[PDB]
Design a protein around this nucleic acid. Structure first.
Length: 143
DNA sequence: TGACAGCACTGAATGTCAAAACAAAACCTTCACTCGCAACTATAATGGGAGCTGTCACGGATGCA
């Protein structure tokens, strides 16, 4: 029912990292590999399988732009199979070399796909301002 | 009744043949200069000890004489 898929993503957003998962591992959620896939297609508007590894790449794209690791820390970190295939699907998502992607300081959100909620989404508000050069005092350290 | 389990097949999306380029310094030319050899200079000059070291002490030694 509608209470299932919402609870599956509470697993899945927390288990987008730890299990090396395809839909066979996702088939342990009450029904078969196809029926859990059939139950997702209409209650969401997204198609689960190519989305998740792309969402796990979208989890890896912010890891490719704001985390301090090289290509092979994050080659198979997000449960992938190869690096050149990971480089390949990246071209169909961001149209940029990952060496070129962390070359430019500008980070545009083209291929990052948002995390899905079947329940109610807490929408933040926006207001566009233009700020001023203000002196302060503080120290720096890294992570 | 509607879930509920599994099949039919697209195909985008992999797993392989190739280069494509970029810094990596790595080994390597370079090319001007800094950093070193070597020789000469023509009034006249001509013999150390460089300070040192001062009585221990019985004992065996070899060679001189």
């Amino acid at each position: 029912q509608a209470g299932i898929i919402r609870d599956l993503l509470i697993w899945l957003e927390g288990h987008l990292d730890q299990p090396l998962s395809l839909d066979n591992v996702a088939a342990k959620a009450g029904y078969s590999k196809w029926h859990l896939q059939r139950m997702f297609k209409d209650v969401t508007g997204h198609a689960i399988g190519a989305y998740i590894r792309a969402r796990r790449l979208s989890k890896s794209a912010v890891a490719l732009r704001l985390t301090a690791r090289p290509i092979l820390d994050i080659a198979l970190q997000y449960r992938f199979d190869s690096q050149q295939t990971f480089t390949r699907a990246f071209k169909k998502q961001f149209a940029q070399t990952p060496a070129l992607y962390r070359r430019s300081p500008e980070w545009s959100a083209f291929g990052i796909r948002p995390p899905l909620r079947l329940g109610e989404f807490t929408m933040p508000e926006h207001k566009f301002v233009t700020l001023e050069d203000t002196p302060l005092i503080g120290v720096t350290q890294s992570y």
